């Protein structure tokens, strides 16, 4: 009852040393569908779940293309995701044009965080309400990164975000000791199994609500959907 | 243990405790007061149909205010606050004309779609109160797009917007198939609009247009509409 | 109306009435909680109306494991027959165009049952203060002309200060139903005293802790000042839930 | 301070600014970091909590590296700390470019402190919510150690502690004759103090971060070798 | 009230309360009067800065000359009136430079009223609390008389009044004004009578009234301020005529 | 353009501000130009509508031009301008709507 | 009460309250008087630094603008300083443009125009000062006053500051038109002495005069001589 | 609530301040416009005719160009700005393109100008509505209406201000293809529509008439009285 | 930005019914937050500033705690109030002195520097965005044709010149003591001025001082450069005084 005066603006501290608008913005990530990302010794894989909806009225894109070695997944607001994707694309293009070479994923993530921190301190703005999973490949090996509305980023071996991703995170943590010594097919199978845990018991993964993104040694970022995911789904178990 | 008052819906830059933008949600609710529009994309063209909703017999129905031409191959449809779409239409026309003049070829629908989206995501200090249905054909083929007051576009195959959108969408779901014909698409649009509309169907209560790979953007006239209505 | 918890209404043969006003900061309600918790009063009935937003919850004054599962509503009455005291607690907010009928019903019940006097704890806005009030005591009082002379003499001895009048009418900004209650009591010849304090919204526990001592200077229901008050068990999370991880 | 605590440009009737006080209170929502200077250099130590098993080893570092000769230890809100680290790096680069030699720690501390203080005057921004320490070593200047808090105040220290339990840590630090000891002898004491202060009931599990800059590294800030850290952890655990 | 905090908010019934309050602020000022005749225009005002220790400088305290053909009188806030008069002079000189011909009176009034209206639409500004009366002559319509409001509205009148007791003055003028057969002498007598019945003073004196006259002579416009001797003569004539009328009953 | 001094005279305050900001940043640090710019913006955000002449007292005090007279103060009086546009158009132009 | 906080808000009766409060701030300052004689003007005021720890030649309340113009104030000193600087700059600009010393009325009009602007915009505060200005032009003296709202008047004799109604009452019956400068100085000092609340000395009052020779601030020796004379 | 700011949406999708700006329009004098076969007629009620007032300066009918005229209802000071802007824009467009401007073009310009002022909290909308009528280059009569929100429509006969409901109800049944046969019949229809809500005879009527290849003409009081007498005689017969 | 706050004492640009600025008045109580007191005394040919040194923690490096600053080679300063505000105002004073020297070709005087600082401070009290600083400044220097100077400026934008002044918590008692001493006599040598200042502080605070608890800074006609005394010299003065 004593919070009503300290939770309307992002530039106001509460008597407990907290800012509630940032936490409220972080609460907006859990209103999107679950996403799973994981990497091996040579490959990085992104797996997303499409919303249960008629394909006639909407074709939503949860996996986007940034460069020839960088791809992202989104969960949250769509306008913020579009703005961030445009910023990353422009930065990569400028880097290539000025000094032709792949742009480091770590520097890209640092730029993203530096850009995101400002609205949490300026007045008249609001924090971004989107969480990103970034899979990339540069001259350091594959990378998996996670971004937060609180302008924080993490370096992960395998992470899941979205609505009801606790089961996926539990599965990933339980099976995290056998990811480096796997090929592409087994890694994609592990990702699909992890993503399947965010569904009720009766439903199963069909070739209508799954998207896959892969990048590796000599393979550029590619997105598979519709009938392109059948070879990956044809070898799975029951449950 | 007391009950108190708290408000989170009076600002466009305020998050609720569950992470919602109530001003944007209200702006989206505002487009439920408009007329119904239907757009169907087929293998050989796109059909856009709207209702005029003439309130008084003294009003001139010959005016065209719901379907707008963007270029020789792109249509449009509207619902909600018509006065809010003028800037978007002007920007789309300017962008497509500039691109055609520079490159010496027509831009795809997606480019003008992104150009329009880049303008609506600037909250003018309030969200728009209109919904659009972009249609057209290109080298890839016929394709349809939908926009909300949130300022983002999506691709669709059969979408209905307006006040009576739920029943129209249910009918479109229980009808329609991938490999169909433009004539029967037009017919089915007429039947669906006939059930949706409260009053009877005439040659002036509605207006529809179509774009196909053969010809340019074409708007049906009264003579053409009468044959289709009589075909019902 | 008063609906008894049991089968027969208790005999409130002119005891006292202690009630809050839904005002800025909920200072009156917090003071009422403090008084009820400290004196260990017992519930005797309900005040059922259609003027407040409905709400329910378990027992806000819980000490053991057998009395913590008793349902409560937004208006209840507690009594202490040994000291001849009656308490009313309001835990909600008023609906539009529903304050004056509530005041009329409450004063009709007060007249019908038969009570010596009514005491109201309230508060007022702090930013609507002139230069002379900014350098004075933040506590004010108010008495109905029907009040007994002994109370007036005692209050004069206490060296208190009375609420100022404005062109003359009584105005209490942010006081809720205090002005309506005072006017109706004046027009219906009921002994009523009002005590208030200038406050602002935020953490308002010290304001209630000051108001209870201000009242105790007069009523002296507790040993004089020279802790004393029992904090109820429901004053646990007044700012919300815990801190999310991965932030600090 | 109710009614006077919604903007950073407001004074209370007793002459206080409460937004800065709330920002300073926000620094106590994070774990504890300490820093002790000795005859040879400065050594840092952070009690880092474990969030999940899915993160890498080198993630969410709280011991930064401003330049070749300056190390930083932060506490509080992490995004603000990263912004301040970027500001400090920019200042050091600008001074090196303009004057041609390494910036003294006092001037860098003054510049960053004034930048922090600039955010406590206007109502269009909010104060920073973090504190940090800086340390360096030079042959002609010796070891130096500073603190900067959200108010914008800097001081030189012999032993310092920021974070949640910054009082028991200071009490433990005040029992060391630190002016006659060496870094190899202060690493173990830092680990012991960190182990003593930590509470395993409210928290679950923590790691140990250590670094020094001093003579044995030729005035260069770097992480402690694994063997020395393991020996220090063994000694700290046996001390309990 | 929750709809009267700024000028950029409409009430549920469609009213502008801040503009209404600004217009209400005019009723505290002195009385100003204007009469149109066949061969001239008139302006009469009431002096408010009356005190034994006040000094007498300038030519008038409430009547200003805008150009060679126009003059005005203000009622309201003096600080805003000064800005308005300076802007009027600038506008007239700008038109003269542009066209090598004097500006018409209605054009000048509209130019000032646009500025006055612009302050009631953009937020963060306080509207001017001033009302004005304008007199002048031009080759298109001849002698003219206008009025202005704090909201930006104007109109053309044959006789009007602004300030204290404006309603009573307007009623008396409407009752006892003849259209088409008025001269300067009759206009002056009517103005004296109206001012005497309007001002809440038992006996009118020449030290609390100022009168200005505009007329045309030999192709030139003459603007002059009457002298205390003439004002005293007019007051004496009015008093003796009233005594005669009372006695012949 | 027409004269070498036209562009130099048009942009003088901007160049002087840039030089002072660069020197201050090199000598003291990043905070001083930031504070100076914020004070300038705050004191400049309040003034009359663009179709009327202002005084700029606080801005002149902050800049230090309260004890100096230049050729911009005695030549071509901006208060007695010979041309002026419509009020609404000027206000809309200042807002960037045009 | 809802209209007592905003500067750009009219009261339902058509009043601006913040300007009234600025005038109230003016009415609580130190007293000051001004008398226009037949051949000069005299300004007097009461000092604020009534202590031995005050350096005499540090800060003054009576200041010159031009060789023939000077002024005194009643209210807030910090607001007075900037207005003095602006007035000096305006006088210099007028001299540069017209090659002739500025008349008093033009300077008063320009200063009042500057003061008026701060009463019509949001986010600012009105000046809390009132000025008395004296001058000599075309062989005759002048005396003006300026309010915080930007309005000015011309006076023969006036008082302002603490207890100014009784001062004006005293001046009303003690004033003569055909009065010389010395008797005007005596009357001004007596009016100041009426409500001094203390014992006057040549070290806690300031006097300035204006005549054909121009504006000039009196030295403490002359003030002591006048005080002894009366 | 949800009505103290210009750019705040109601929980059911309403902008209440823009709707309040139309209550000001609903309180102005009645204005009627009728589109004929080869003529266009406007008519405005005259209210509160003061004795010492000059009628030349209080006219509510204006000429935007040689073939476009307009009438308005609402706040009087707000209409002047829009009229001046439209007058300037007509000449600007004539410079841009040699051909004379179009009624729809000028209506769209006015609508966009009105809509520009409903986008920010720092300015308030225009509380006026207008009836724009005129002739095109080919020679087809047109009639349009503009709202304070920025929307416009094409009509055959309309009314604004107070009494618009009754006037429109009368027009809906009295507007046929026979009543617009001649200019006299159209003028009689407009006068009959005005007389429903206007008392005190035909002394409170202001009429304007525009024909093909001619300029706007304002009818005289004698002509208005003659038309009223003819209408009364025909009704009595 | 945020907007003003309703109330007669909650915003800087709002007058009260008696025409007072309570937000300006509340900035004068921030000077007492530190808890220290300063004393400045002007002699026949010298000026002295004495302040109080308090180092509560034993882990602090006492070399980094000071309140005496050097603005120019010939101008000294002492600050009372909030530490960060004092440091920022010192930086601004240095910048203003540099600007004056560049523009006019010679060193700024003490009175001109104080006037410029007060002019800057006055702007903060009339705009609804900035806030006043909670500190006060005291400057000393030597004038080539007038002699020693002592000046002080306030958070409200008011400045004046004195013969002896004080600031902090015990300002009134220090003022009364200095008034009595100056009334008795005012012509002092270099040794008598510093002894007068130290005796004033000791008498007012009721304390016997150690050479590590006070700070002393002086200027002299013979040596115009600002100088800060050392512990040995302070102890010598204390021994001579006792």
Numbering used by the authors:
A (entry chain E): 1 to 239
B (entry chain D): 1 to 123, 133 to 241
C (entry chain J): 1 to 167, 177 to 235, 243 to 264
D (entry chain F): 5 to 244
E (entry chain B): 3 to 251
F (entry chain H): 44 to 141
G (entry chain A): 4 to 233
H (entry chain C): 2 to 238
What does the paper say about this structure?
Key differences between structures 1 and 2 set the stage for the β4 incorporation seen in structure 3. One side of β4 binds a composite surface from β3 and the β2 propeptide, while its other side binds the α4 region that was bound to PAC4 in structure 1. Structures 3 and 4 are analogous to recent structures of yeast 13S and pre-15S intermediates, respectively. Structures 3 and 4, as well as the human preholo intermediate, also allow comparison to previously determined structures of the corresponding yeast 13S, pre-15S and preholo intermediates, both validating our approach and revealing conserved or species-specific aspects of assembly. In structures 3–5, β2’s residues 225–237 face the α-ring and cling to the adjacent α2 subunit.
Dedicated assembly factors orchestrate the stepwise production of many molecular machines, including the 28-subunit proteasome core particle (CP) that mediates protein degradation. The CP is composed of four stacked α-rings and β-rings, each containing seven distinct α or β subunits. Unlike conventional proteases, the proteasome harbors three different types of active site (β1 or caspase-like, β2 or trypsin-like and β5 or chymotrypsin-like), each present twice. Previous work identified five CP chaperones: proteasome maturation protein (POMP, also called hUmp1)29–34 and proteasome assembly chaperones 1–4 (PAC1–PAC4).
